[PDB]
Amino acid sequence: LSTASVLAFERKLDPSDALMSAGAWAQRDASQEWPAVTVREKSQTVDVANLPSDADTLKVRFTLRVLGGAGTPSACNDAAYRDKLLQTVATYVNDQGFAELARRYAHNLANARFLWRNRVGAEAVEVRINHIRQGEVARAWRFDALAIGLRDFKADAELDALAELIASGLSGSGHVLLEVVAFARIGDGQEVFPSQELKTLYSVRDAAAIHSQKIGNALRTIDTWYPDEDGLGPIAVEPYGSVTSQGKAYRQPKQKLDFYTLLDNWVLRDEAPAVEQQHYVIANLIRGGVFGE
Amino acid sequence: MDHYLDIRLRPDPEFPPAQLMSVLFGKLHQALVAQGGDRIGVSFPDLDESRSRLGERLRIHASADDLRALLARPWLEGLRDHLQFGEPAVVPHPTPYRQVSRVQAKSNPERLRRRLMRRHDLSEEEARKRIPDTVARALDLPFVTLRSQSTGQHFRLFIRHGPLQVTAEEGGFTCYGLSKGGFVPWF
């Protein structure tokens, strides 16, 4: 009848941190053991991240574990609100799978948005994707990131086969684990852009890295279902969808397109939004967070 | 002047005003800095000093061949997927006073000014009395940031241009080649 005061949603599509390492282009065959990128100083004391000057290619590697079971909250007070929420997702999943969502998730691995300030200014970016059922690779992939459009989404039989894998993970059909490896020609000794500590740089084994949540922000720019305008490209799926760099928000509570307003209609008030608007509702349950009163 | 150009940078997260798209506005002139080319007329067509940004598009004033086919340097990258792209056209047929672009106008002299204050065989107690800090004073130079070895984010800039002529011709060459005095496109 009403939302519970506690709604904690365990997130899905959990990324890791991304190690960075240099290396020469066309050395992708023996590209396993590279020297990484440290964090040095220059003088007034700042912390910069640069390649070794003999190399031209940044190597970025993280892992991604698709969990699935996106309907069940981890913490919920009332069971009748909990059950009908599970009934509402079961209405969604039976009508259509996670394929249209995951095909938009299948892009963000291919055209490497997780290269945030590293893709802009590059000239050749190649992303490896491997499915590892065991320690061995059970399924491999190979994708250009510049040919696949950063602002425009298009389908491919290689992408759709990869989309069905992430759809199989989100629907709970099995286990999906991914090894994303990104080679990018930036140039000799150039400035790569790691994540900015609150000013040092986030390094782990004295090897500069990107935050895990700063990668997961790049893996969820799926919301093209704006109130205002799709001309600026996709934006990360968030309740009260807002961009810090553009400064303005979208999806106001005065508008009837708010995620909380949609969820109260789509679950409590039994008022279904559009099918194009249903994809925005589910893609915040994969995000997770404290919802409810 | 002879062939005025434009470059549209589309809106996105990575091109906001913080450091992914702030610093690529007065220091990203690699076509006049590193990528190849030194003899163009800098004329930004978005000279609006209210927001402190003297250029909105990638406005460049070149010749007819330099705008049609002689402007293929690496100073126009990033607009393949992270923005839009432009092309060349004709020069200003009317009298446009677009003699203002990214040029060598800026007031950051405090980066190395101790030799003009206290590095003249004296001590360091004259860094503002003998030679003051009046040139190393940041002001309202309407111009996009720079991404050199002065900060991890963007920086300050300025517009080293002035008036523009009435005919079609590339003006004078400043540090940025800002084509001031030549009748470039007004906007």
UniProtKB/Swiss-Prot annotation, chain B:
Recorded consequence of changing H29K: Cleaves pre-crRNA 130-fold slower
Outcome after substituting S150A: Cleaves pre-crRNA 350-fold slower
Pfam families: Cas_Csy4
Disruption-associated phenotype: Infection with phage DMS3 inhibits biofilm formation; disrupting this gene restores biofilm formation despite DMS3 infection. Normal biofilm formation in the absence of phage infection. Loss of production of crRNA in the presence or absence of phage. Disruption of the entire Y.pestis-subtype CRISPR region disrupts crRNA production but does not alter phage resistance (possibly OLNs PA14_33350 to PA14_33310, plus the flanking CRISPR loci), indicating this CRISPR is not involved in phage resistance.
Site (Substrate binding) residue list: S148
Keyword list, A-Z: Antiviral defense, Endonuclease, Hydrolase, Nuclease, RNA-binding
Free-text remark on how the cofactor is bound: Metal-ion independent.
GO function terms (MF aspect): endonuclease activity; RNA binding
Effect caused by changing E49A: No biofilm formation upon phage infection, no crRNA formed
Active site (catalytic residues): H29 (proton acceptor)
A Gene Ontology BP annotation from the UniProt entry: maintenance of CRISPR repeat elements
InterPro entries cross-referenced by the UniProt entry: CRISPR-assoc_prot_Csy4, CRISPR-Cas6/Csy4_sf
Reported impact of T151A: Cleaves pre-crRNA 380-fold slower
EC number(s) given by UniProt: 3.1.-.-
Further information: In this bacteria, Y.pestis-subtype CRISPRs do not confer resistance to phage DMS3 or MP22, but instead are required for DMS3-dependent inhibition of biofilm formation and possibly motility.
The family this protein is said to belong to: Belongs to the CRISPR-associated endoribonuclease Cas6 family. Cas6f/Csy4, subtype I-F/Ypest subfamily.
Assembly and binders: Part of the Csy ribonucleoprotein complex with a probable stoichiometry of Csy1(1),Csy2(1),Csy3(6),Cas6/Csy4(1)-crRNA(1). A Csy3(6),Cas6/Csy4(1)-crRNA(1) subcomplex is also formed.
Function (record text): CRISPR (clustered regularly interspaced short palindromic repeat) is an adaptive immune system that provides protection against mobile genetic elements (viruses, transposable elements and conjugative plasmids). CRISPR clusters contain sequences complementary to antecedent mobile elements and target invading nucleic acids. CRISPR clusters are transcribed and processed into CRISPR RNA (crRNA). Processes pre-crRNA into individual crRNA units. Absolutely required for crRNA production or stability.
Protein name as annotated: CRISPR-associated endonuclease Cas6/Csy4
Gene from which this protein is expressed: cas6f
